[PDB]
């Protein structure tokens, strides 16, 4: 309701705010922080949208088809995507992370290099991005000035010192073995899944992104309204174990269940604020 400000210094003035929403029906807490930059020297205004918050993984063994079949639902993807409309004159200047990456933990410090510039570092005062993603990759979805977005999808994973196993893993005897607790163990199918204790925390607790898009709009721009869609989603897979005769045999079905959680925020470039 105020839009808080700092400034650094007689060049710029950082109008900063935060916009949270808790999508209980999709198990997501979207946290969207924003920072307006007003470097009078440079000709354009910079908006840096930091998309924090947490998507719950929603790993779940969901039914029992007798004691020889059972299905597991697990998160094989997470996304966050920003996207301006086709007609609009604002442009996506910069974004972080800038490349795709494996590393367990991403981390970089964003600062403003007094030139309409905002660059990242991995080792002048500003805040820093970090997010952990064990057993996952981060893929930069094909960005342009209109649209940018990340998808942290499942990479591979060890299973009780065997493995590693991925979504496209296959053994003729045992099939796919991602969350197969035992191989030829006589028990209820539903009891023979891998405890979420023994896999990635992104599967249970879930993902918590810390990405940063930055948008530029010119002071001279004839229309200072600016709408943008911020879509968090969760792709989930279907993994069924079933007894064969002599042993167990699992199998994955890619991308059964999706959870597109779209919000759309308005940006007053003049009064330098943002709200859903």
């Amino acid at each position: 309701i105020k839009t808080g400000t700092t400034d650094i210094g007689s060049n710029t003035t950082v109008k900063t705010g935060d916009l949270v929403t808790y999508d209980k029906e999709n198990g997501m807490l979207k946290k969207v922080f924003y920072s307006f930059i007003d470097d009078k020297n440079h000709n354009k205004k910079l908006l840096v949208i930091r998309t924090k918050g947490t998507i719950a993984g929603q790993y779940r063994v969901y039914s029992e088809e007798g004691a020889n079949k059972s299905g597991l639902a697990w998160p094989s993807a997470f996304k966050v995507q920003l996207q301006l409309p086709d007609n609009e004159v604002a442009q996506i200047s910069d974004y972080y992370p800038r490349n795709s990456i494996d590393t367990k933990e991403y981390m970089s410090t964003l600062t403003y290099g007094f030139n309409g510039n905002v660059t990242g570092d991995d080792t002048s005062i500003g805040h820093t991005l970090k997010y952990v993603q064990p057993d996952f990759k981060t893929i930069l979805e094909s960005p342009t000035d209109k649209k940018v977005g990340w998808k942290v999808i499942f990479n591979n994973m060890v299973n009780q010192n065997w493995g590693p196993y991925d979504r496209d893993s296959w053994n003729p005897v045992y099939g796919n073995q991602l969350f197969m607790k035992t191989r030829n163990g006589s028990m209820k199918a539903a009891d023979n899944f891998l405890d979420p204790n023994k896999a990635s925390s992104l599967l249970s607790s879930g993902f918590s992104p810390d990405f940063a898009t930055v948008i530029t709009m010119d002071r001279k721009a004839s229309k200072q309204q600016t709408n943008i869609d911020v879509i968090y989603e969760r792709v989930r897979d279907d993994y069924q174990l079933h007894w064969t005769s002599t042993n167990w045999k699992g199998t994955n079905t890619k991308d059964k269940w999706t959870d597109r959680s779209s919000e759309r925020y308005k940006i007053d470039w003049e009064k330098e604020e943002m709200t859903n």
Epitope: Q58, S63, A190, R236, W257
Partner: antibody, heavy 125, light 109 residues
Framework: QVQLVQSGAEVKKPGSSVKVSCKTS????????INWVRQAPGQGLEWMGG????????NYAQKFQGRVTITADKSTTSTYLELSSLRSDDTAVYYC??????????????????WGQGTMVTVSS | ETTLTQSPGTLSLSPGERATLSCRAS???????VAWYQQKPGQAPRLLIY???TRATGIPDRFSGSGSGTDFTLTISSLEPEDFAVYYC?????????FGQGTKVDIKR
Amino acid sequence: QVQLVQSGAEVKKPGSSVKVSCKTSGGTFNNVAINWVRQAPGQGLEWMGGIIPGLDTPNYAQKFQGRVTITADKSTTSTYLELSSLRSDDTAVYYCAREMEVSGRWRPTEAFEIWGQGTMVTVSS
Amino acid sequence: ETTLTQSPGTLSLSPGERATLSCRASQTISNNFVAWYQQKPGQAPRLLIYGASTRATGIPDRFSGSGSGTDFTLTISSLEPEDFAVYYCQQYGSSPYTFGQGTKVDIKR
């Protein structure tokens, strides 16, 4: 004030099929499992099936042999319990019972926390 | 199935006295997941205890769960007028999610 409100009582000719509904009032809907439990007059309770709306994954009791078939619906925020080839011995109260919405649930269901009023199905020729 | 079987049949006691309902399983119910419901005439049942020992929201300390292996037991610390009803144990781990037959408590004259 999260709450369930089931359909009106009914009476069905034996051989026909019934389906009672159960709408979720207050509170969330999607990944919280709704079960159906049934009670004959002055009798024990009997689990029949459940459904996890979001996944739309039904969980059926195997004794019933798929006569029982359960579904969910977002527009109505409700579940349905259909039962085919009704008989004299089905005449019972039919409660829907939403599970307890616990933090880290990775199993189907767990502990039937809030129940509807029950629907009376009374199969008689 | 994993068939529970409660005891005793009826429980003829007066208020102030403690009543200990027992419930025993075919096989281990895991131990995760065993609930106790109280049903009064005409109404639906009412979740008292879950998991095994921890009690559902709003239930008074009077009601108390405990057990292990294949024997679980609900204890009413000090029976109160309203507590005289039927009591149903259940396991909700393995499908089919079996219910006990039911033990009734009964004001004693």
